[PDB]
Amino acid sequence: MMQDATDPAVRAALQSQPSGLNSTDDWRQVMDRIMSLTARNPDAFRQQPQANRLSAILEAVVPARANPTHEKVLAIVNALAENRAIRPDEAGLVYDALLQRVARYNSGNVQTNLDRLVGDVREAVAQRERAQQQGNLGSMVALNAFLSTQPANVPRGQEDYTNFVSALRLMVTETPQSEVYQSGPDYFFQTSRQGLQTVNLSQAFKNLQGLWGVRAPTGDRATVSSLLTPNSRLLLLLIAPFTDSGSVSRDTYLGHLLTLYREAIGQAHVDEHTFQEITSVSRALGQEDTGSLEATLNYLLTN
Amino acid sequence: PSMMPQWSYMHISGQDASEYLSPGLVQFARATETYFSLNNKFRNPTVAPTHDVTTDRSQRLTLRFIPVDREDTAYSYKARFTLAVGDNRVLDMASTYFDI
Amino acid sequence: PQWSYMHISGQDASEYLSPGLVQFARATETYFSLNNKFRNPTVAPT
């Protein structure tokens, strides 16, 4: 089990308010401790020195108003650090700039809002932290711009593309984390990893609009399908762990190559379980076994 | 061997400070320390058994070694030794020296 | 009540204070000699 982002209203409380005994806030906890009612040891208040004994009585029986503002205003500014509304080095300015703002306006209806906004801003950290795990929000809106600009449902050659419409939508829903459909240049493009080692254009996909339905030769790479760019080829291998059945595997490469993209993944996860064993058995071989990779090469070439 | 014979009364057979003390005096030696600085008053017995150390055998401690050949050139004195440690000769290096 | 707010009728250094730099006081001693940077109280028994 794991925690959510360390509670932003509590992190700032951790650094300000008393830890052990706040005699006013934890009143019936000190009162329980002084009445010899605590289950740990009853006479923990009796065996204590007489002077600090009296300090517990004066503070608990007469509750003293402790300063609450600096654990409320800091609760906003540290949430401003976790929601990233300010930079971490900005904690010197905004903490006091708003304290100087409430120095001028201590006593309007604004601070009655402020503590209600404290509960709102602390929840906004918890809302966004669960929302950044699903980076769908900066992805689906971007795909809405892709679906509108690109002409949808126009394969007047042959139609297998209706299945492909949902295939791109499945990539948004299944993996959301680093999967951002960034619109930097006017061509749309999707990143798969946190460092973006396969971020091809979804407008390199515009090469497929004339190749949505053509004739198939035989079983070896086609006499025509050499036109398919390694840019668009990178996309079609990336949608392959998402959609398989739907596109016709016998009419054009939209389906025949998509089934063949599963052959690339099908070998990969087998060889993953192959490599994790031969590398693990290095005590009995005592060599840099590149034959683990050479057999992997042999299991792809000699078929 | 049985380690509870005649030193039991004298409390010498004992294993710690609070062993053969009355268990109500531990919180006066420790807590009110500089006031009642008393823990050697009841002299706690040592913890030096027979377990791994005892070598009732002709075990070598100090051995000599004197070189094979001699070279008496003016600038660099050379001495060749072919040292051999058999078994259980467990020296720590700072012990070894060269008697000039 | 204000008597023991001056850290006069306190028990100990790292404990009586807010836990924000209690974590940091135990980790930092050579960077800053923090034990002499704050009052440590000691009180009369019964």
Binding site: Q48, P49 | Y35 | G10, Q11, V43
Partner: peptide
């Protein structure tokens, strides 16, 4: 007894003790 000594920081007595024997 926990009451018997004056202790630092609101704690009666704190760190326990040990005194060495003569021979060695």
């Amino acid at each position: 007894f926990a009451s018997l000594a004056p202790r630092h920081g609101s704690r009666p007595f704190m760190g326990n003790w040990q005194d060495i024997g003569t021979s060695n």
